[PDB]
Amino acid sequence: DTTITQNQTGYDNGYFYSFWTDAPGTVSMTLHSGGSYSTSWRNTGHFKAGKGWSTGGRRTVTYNASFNPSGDAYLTLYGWTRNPLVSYLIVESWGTYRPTGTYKGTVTTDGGTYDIYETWRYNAPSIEGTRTFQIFWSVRQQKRTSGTITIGNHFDAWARAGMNLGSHDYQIMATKGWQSSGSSTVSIS
């Protein structure tokens, strides 16, 4: 299999993929069969890696993962929209840090209940450069590492809470990490 360490996007085995880190060489992504990839990180900075789609939408995504963070990492359906500029995360599992923000309610979907949060980033990196923008979160109340994500149920719950999305940019089933070490294997279907 091919192992990626350069920041890049592309297509692999039928799927869009994206890999990014601010600490090159401390994290890799190995591209596997079909909708699968693995990651390995050691004393890293920030990274995001995943397979998915170059343009997001209201997909119903089934995934299966092995997820082994030593510290802070998320297993998350992650994406962006433009105009409004929004990053969003449906967080299925996490490591030592459970992400939270301004509490906006809950959504029950796919056998779980998720807390909804909004955060803001100011003068921060984005798909469009240095910007100020919202992050929308659905964070599962208990961790899970496989199942189905009915993305539209999250989008609709966010909209009911006044959290509005724009035109879709990329959308990936991601491993995202901040410091420390770990590994994952994530398979979408």
Is the sign of the CA dihedral 117, 118, 123, 126 positive or negative? positive
Q: Residue 117 belongs to what domain range?
A: 2-188
Q: Nearest-CA neighbor of 72 among 105, 44, 95?
A: 95
- DSSP string over 37-75: EEEEESS--EEEEEEEESS--S-EEEEEEEEEESSEEEE
Method of determination is X-ray
- Check: CB of residue 42 under 8 Å from CB of residue 6: no
Which 8-state DSSP code applies to residue 162?
T
- Check: CB of residue 80 under 8 Å from CB of residue 120: no
Which 8-state DSSP code applies to residue 16?
E
Q: Strand, helix or coil at 158?
A: helix
Give the strand pairing for 86-94 and 131-140: parallel
CATH number at residue 32: 2.60.120.180
- Sorted by sequence, the CB contacts under 8 Å of residue 102 that are 6+ apart come out as 117, 118, 119
- Residue with the two structure tokens 């990053």: 87
Q: Nearest-CA neighbor of 167 among 15, 54, 76, 89?
A: 54
Count of domains forming the chain:
1
